[PDB]
Amino acid sequence: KRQSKRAYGDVTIQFYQPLDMRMYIPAGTTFTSTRQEYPQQFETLVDYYAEPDSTEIVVEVYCKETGVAG
Amino acid sequence: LRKTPFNPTEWRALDMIKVPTEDFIEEDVGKSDVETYSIFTATPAGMLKELNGDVFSKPQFHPELTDRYGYTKFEVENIYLTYSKIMKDLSNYGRDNISKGIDKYTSKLSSKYKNLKKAQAKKIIEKFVKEGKVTEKEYEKITGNKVDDELTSDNRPKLTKDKLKSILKEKFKTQDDFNNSKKKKKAKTDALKELTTKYRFGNKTHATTLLDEYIKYKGEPPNDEAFDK
Amino acid sequence: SFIGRTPEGSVFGTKPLITEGSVVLIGFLNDDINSPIILSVYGDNEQNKMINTNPLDGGKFDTESVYKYSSSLYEILPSLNYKYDDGEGTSIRTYNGKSFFSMTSGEEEKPQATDFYTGTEYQDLFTSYYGNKTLIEPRIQKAPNMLFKHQGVFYDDGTPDNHITTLFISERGDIRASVLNTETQKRTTQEMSSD
Amino acid sequence: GNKTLIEPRIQKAPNMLFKHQGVFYDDGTPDNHITTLFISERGDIRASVLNTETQKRTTQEMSSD
Amino acid sequence: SFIGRTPEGSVFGTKPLITEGSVVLIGFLNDDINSPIILSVYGDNEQNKMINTNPLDGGKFDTESVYKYSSSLYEILPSLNYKYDDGEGTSIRTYNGKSFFSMTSGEEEKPQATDFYTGTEYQDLFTSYY
Amino acid sequence: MVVRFQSSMGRSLKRVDSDDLNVKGLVLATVSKINYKYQSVEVKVNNLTLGSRIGDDGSLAVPYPKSFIGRTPEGSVFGTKPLITEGSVVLIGFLNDDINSPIILSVYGDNEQNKMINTNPLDGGKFDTES
Amino acid sequence: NVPEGTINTIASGSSLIRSVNNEYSFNTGTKEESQEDFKRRFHSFVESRGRATNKSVRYGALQIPDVEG
Amino acid sequence: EELAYPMNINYFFTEGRFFTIFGKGHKYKVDVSKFIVGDILFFGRSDTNIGIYVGDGEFISMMGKFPKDETPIGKYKLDDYWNEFNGRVMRFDEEVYI
Amino acid sequence: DGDNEVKFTGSSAHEVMTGIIRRFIPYMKYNYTENTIDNYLDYDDLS
């Protein structure tokens, strides 16, 4: 039998105002939650760049824990 | 001056020395909880600071360890390191609200719909606030679009391979187009303008690639993959 | 900026603008926590890069050419209309809508403060852009109405002052220069209509 | 302070102007009234009121002579 | 505020107003007593309360309504005639006697910078009060 | 004795350690070079230069005080850019009294410069006097 | 033998310098000469003992270490 | 091609047809030779005028007194006008636009 | 330059430490009949 697959999905970012200049997101940014039922972490694999005049950006994320908790 | 030997392979690189109990005069060795930390981090050189720049720090902890000793930190500095919808949206905020920050409210419309560039949505808002309304003449003047076409938002055709093959036969009807580059730029832009928008799927760079192969092979490439691609 | 009291007793001073979410340096009294004071307000690198029109990456301030761009007291009010001064003779001030005041002496810079035909547009002025080549939109687009009202109380002759004069300008472009004596019920106005 | 005159850096005469314009107002109609108080380097004074869309102007001009 | 020298050699700078009996923060060089410098000038709570026309007790600066009053570069010269600017289109400047200069765009604020009949009085402007 | 031979300083015996590395107080410097794009200067100590890393202008520099800066509810940023001058004397306060963490507090001119740029002829006197 | 546009900075104060770059690659960085190269050099040396010959001038001008062609 | 009238200074920034070759604020006399015919040359401290580059170190523009000069279009050497060049240079691109 | 400022640059500790030690070690002269500290201290094989 083959091993389990890590959960992955899309996460949506909402800013107060559209960015005036281009911003860089450092690699390996950690996405998490505050509910006690799901304390599982997430982390990005590739670079992303938030171009100006963009009020939202979507980046893919992969569940570090290998299980259905993701 | 060497890296610390606590690394696994560097630990093995140290020379071993043996000594039996037969040379022991006295001993005083034991455990101790004098040093105890839970969170470890290596901050970069102290000029960089969280409120005026890039990522400040990135610590590490064990969940079981912090129960006994909670949040015990250990820090070290390292010196080294859609005409209707557009009009409705303007009518939703209103001219009083839009008039305060036309540049950034423009970014809201361009963010929602990637069909409009910053210049295109900048001009329509200026015309909206000054005149107080926008008509179909203003919209088409800003950019050529089919305003009198409501099909597309509910249903837009598939563009299977034979349809593309047919649309290329409309956009290139004579051989001089390949030879005369000036009209070729006009032709291909008209192809991409309908081909990206009107049908289910649109992409510039992909469609460009096909057009560059199509042009090079004079509209009859040696394989049907050019129309698959 | 400064604060004090006059010999008469009246208090005078300033109220510099305060902004939420700005970064401020703090110095504790006698190095005691629970004794804070704000020393100054420092902006972010992005914010500083946005609110400057200097294109030079670097260079000594003593160079004549660098003096043209470096030497620029560039300031923006809470209102998005800004005020500008420079070591050269250019100086630009802005008000509500696209209205502005400008002055200059070099013939090269003559377009910046010209009135040929319709006059220079607001977009022609290079100070009207943010650093990241975005136009500095005014917050309020409605046209203003100016006036220079002049009056007093008395003078060395001892007689009560009752001469009132104004230089009112309306939102519709009208101009009215008037001199008034209110006690004597007399007035002389020079009026210009929008038409 | 040390009894030297404060020379101006630039000795060439300036040219001032007070340009006034807008976009709209509470009546809802587009704003198109332009007025200026231009002053030239040669001492001229020009007070003008303009309506650009209607192609109408009234100027009060003073020459250097 | 700023001080320097031009390439030609002439010195330029500023002389900010100095006041007796004001409270000033001091920072000693290398934490040595007998090495003082003044960092800035801070006024008393009463003085600050007297020289502001904001009636709001509190509120986030991001609120549109609070922006009308919070955003006010309110300054008073050594002469008791003052200068005023705001995030709205109102801007008021004063000179000797009751003379003033004002500008505004909102019809609601039209009285503040009107010239009907005798014009707006100096007492009608709400910025003219402590 | 034999063990006393360690890092020490002063006429009185004092253990020199990582406390001595930390600066106490504020120090002065001169503005040698300015980054006009970011308006962040690098100040020179008498025989050392602070700030001034491999980063050209944005990612490392010394911040300068601003009159006021913020953002409006609409989102647009507003602030001021006070004039910056080369060779002026500036007071500096290190963060958490750490060397390699500078900030400029204010700009102070020389006695001669201050004497040149004032027209007050009075030598002295209480400010409360009418004259 | 770094690639093109590798040397970015002068690693100093660089007050009057904006940026530094190299338009050409470094090719003179070479490892120690192998046996074959030494044999070739030595056979030219043996054949270059008589002066006033082209093959002699070849060694004459090749004796400098930096010269390759 | 059509562009957008009057093409005041704005167009070069928000109308996307151009990509900058050299930025404003630096002025090198040796790197002028690398330019190509048709490069748009700016002039003035506040973008007062622009020009078209032609080879042999020249440029095409109109120059004359401000109040409506009667001088016709003409070509001038770059040596005398090099002081007021301001270093800004831009180039056209038509294949990828729309 | 002109001032006594000296800057040391390297991408690793062994590169920096070489420059630091080499800057001052030779000139630290003494009256040894035979050399100085550089002969008696290898300060090599750093990483």
User: DSSP of C67-120, one letter per residue?
Assistant: HHHH---EEE-SSS-EEEE-SSS-EEEE-STT-EEEE---STTGGGG--STT--
Touch of D by B (3+ CB pairs closer than 8 Å): yes
Question: Rounded to 5, what percent of chain I is helix, strand, coil?
Answer: 35, 0, 65
Q: At what angle do helices B118-131 and B83-93 cross, to 10 degrees?
A: 60
Cα–Cα distance for residue pair E113/G4, rounded to 1 Å: 66
Amino acid at E88: E
Tokens of F41: 């200067």
Write out the residues of chain F at the interface with chain I, using a CB-CB cutoff of 8 A.
44, 46-49
CB-CB neighbors (< 8 A) of D2 in chain F: 115-116
Contact criterion met (CB below 8 Å) for I45 and I13: no
Cα–Cα distance for residue pair B41/B32, rounded to 1 Å: 23
Contact criterion met (CB below 8 Å) for B121 and B108: no
Nearest chain F residue (CA) to C80: F78
Tokens of C9: 């007793």
Amino acid at C75: E
Q: At what angle do helices B204-216 and B181-197 cross, to 10 degrees?
A: 140
B164: left (phi over 0), alpha (psi -120 to 50) or beta: alpha
Report which DSSP code applies to C172.
T
Report which DSSP code applies to C47.
H
**Beta-carbon separation of F109 and E3 below 8 A:** yes
Cα–Cα distance for residue pair A8/A25, rounded to 1 Å: 19
In this complex, is the C-beta atom of B100 within 8 Å of any C-beta atom belonging to chain C? Answer: yes
The CA-to-CA distance between both ends of chain C, in Å, stands at 46
Touch of E by I (3+ CB pairs closer than 8 Å): no
With residue B108 as reference, give the H or E element that holds it: helix B102-112
How far F13 CA lies from chain C's nearest CA (Å)?
25
Cα–Cα distance for residue pair B43/B59, rounded to 1 Å: 9
Q: Strands, E, within chain D: which ranges? A: 17-19, 33-39, 45-51, 56-62
Cα–Cα distance for residue pair I47/I42, rounded to 1 Å: 14
Cα–Cα distance for residue pair C90/C73, rounded to 1 Å: 11
CB-CB neighbors (< 8 A) of H10 in chain C: 123, 135
Amino acid at B64: E
Phi/psi of residue C23, nearest 5 degrees? -90, 130
In this complex, is the C-beta atom of H2 within 8 Å of any C-beta atom belonging to chain B? Answer: no
In which residue are the tokens 């401290």 written?
Answer: H45
Residues 6+ apart with CB under 8 A from B179: none
Reference D30, options B142, C123, C143, C96; nearest CA is C143
Cα C25-C30-C36 angle, rounded to 5 deg: 35
Cα–Cα distance for residue pair E48/C13, rounded to 1 Å: 8
Reference F51, options F84, F83, F36, F29; nearest CA is F29
Question: What three-state secondary structure class fits E62?
Answer: coil
**Beta-carbon separation of B51 and C139 below 8 A:** no
**Beta-carbon separation of B189 and H96 below 8 A:** no
Contact criterion met (CB below 8 Å) for E78 and E20: no
Reference D20, options B173, C171, C24, B188; nearest CA is C171
Contact criterion met (CB below 8 Å) for B82 and B66: no
In sign, the C-alpha dihedral spanning B138, B141, B143, B149 is positive
Which chains contact I through at least 3 pairs of Cβ atoms less than 8 Å apart?
Answer: B, F, G
Which chains contact G through at least 3 pairs of Cβ atoms less than 8 Å apart?
Answer: C, F, I
Cα C31-C36-C40 angle, rounded to 5 deg: 105
Residues 6+ apart with CB under 8 A from E72: C15, C17, C78, E53, E54, E84, E85, E86, E87
Cα–Cα distance for residue pair D20/D35, rounded to 1 Å: 5
CB-CB neighbors (< 8 A) of A18 in chain F: 75
Residues 6+ apart with CB under 8 A from C156: none
Cα–Cα distance for residue pair C44/C34, rounded to 1 Å: 26
Cα–Cα distance for residue pair H24/D14, rounded to 1 Å: 26
Say how many CA atoms lie within 13 Å of B36 toward its Cβ: 11
Beta-sheet pairing, A30-31 with A42-43: antiparallel
The radius of gyration computed from the CA coordinates of chain I, to the nearest angstrom, equals: 13
CB-CB neighbors (< 8 A) of F60 in chain G: none
The CA-to-CA distance between both ends of chain H, in Å, stands at 11
The radius of gyration computed from the CA coordinates of chain A, to the nearest angstrom, equals: 14
Cα–Cα distance for residue pair B202/B191, rounded to 1 Å: 11
Contact criterion met (CB below 8 Å) for B177 and B187: yes
Nearest chain E residue (CA) to D27: E107
How far D65 CA lies from chain C's nearest CA (Å)?
19
In this complex, is the C-beta atom of F18 within 8 Å of any C-beta atom belonging to chain B? Answer: no
- Nearest Cβ partner for E78 among C12, C27, C168: C12
CB-CB neighbors (< 8 A) of F34 in chain E: none
Cα–Cα distance for residue pair B132/B135, rounded to 1 Å: 10
CA distances from H32 to D25, E109, H37, H82 (A): 50, 56, 11, 10
Residues 6+ apart with CB under 8 A from G17: G10
Q: What's the distance, CA C137 to chain centroid?
A: 16
CA distances from C118 to D31, D33, H45, I45 (A): 15, 11, 21, 77
E46: left (phi over 0), alpha (psi -120 to 50) or beta: alpha
Technique used to solve these coordinates: cryo-EM
Contact criterion met (CB below 8 Å) for D44 and D63: yes
Cα–Cα distance for residue pair C191/C173, rounded to 1 Å: 11
Cα–Cα distance for residue pair F129/F107, rounded to 1 Å: 30
In which residue are the tokens 């020079």 written?
Answer: C190
Cα–Cα distance for residue pair C186/E121, rounded to 1 Å: 19
**Beta-carbon separation of D30 and B99 below 8 A:** no
Nearest chain I residue (CA) to G14: I1
**Burial class of residue B181, CB neighbours in 10 A (0-12, 13-18, 19+):** exposed
- Listed by number, the residues of chain F in 43-72 with a beta carbon closer than 8 Å to a beta carbon of chain A are 71
Q: What's the distance, CA C83 to chain centroid?
A: 4
In this complex, is the C-beta atom of A18 within 8 Å of any C-beta atom belonging to chain F? Answer: yes
Q: What's the distance, CA B188 to chain centroid?
A: 27
Nearest chain H residue (CA) to B142: H4
CB-CB neighbors (< 8 A) of A20 in chain F: 77
Reference H22, options H14, H33, H11; nearest CA is H33
- Listed by number, the residues of chain I in 27-46 with a beta carbon closer than 8 Å to a beta carbon of chain B are 43, 46
Cα–Cα distance for residue pair G30/G66, rounded to 1 Å: 11
Question: What three-state secondary structure class fits E6?
Answer: coil
- Which of B47, B56, B80, B99 best tests the F interface by mutation, with the highest count of F CBs <10 A? B47
In sign, the C-alpha dihedral spanning H68, H70, H75, H78 is negative
In this complex, is the C-beta atom of B55 within 8 Å of any C-beta atom belonging to chain A? Answer: yes
Reference F87, options C87, E3, I5; nearest CA is E3
By residue count, chain E amounts to 130
- Strand partners of residue G59: none
Reference D16, options D53, D54, D42, D51; nearest CA is D42
Reference B107, options B92, B97, B120, B94; nearest CA is B120
**Beta-carbon separation of E6 and D9 below 8 A:** yes
CB-CB neighbors (< 8 A) of B58 in chain A: 28
Contact criterion met (CB below 8 Å) for B147 and B140: yes
Tokens of A44: 């990005």
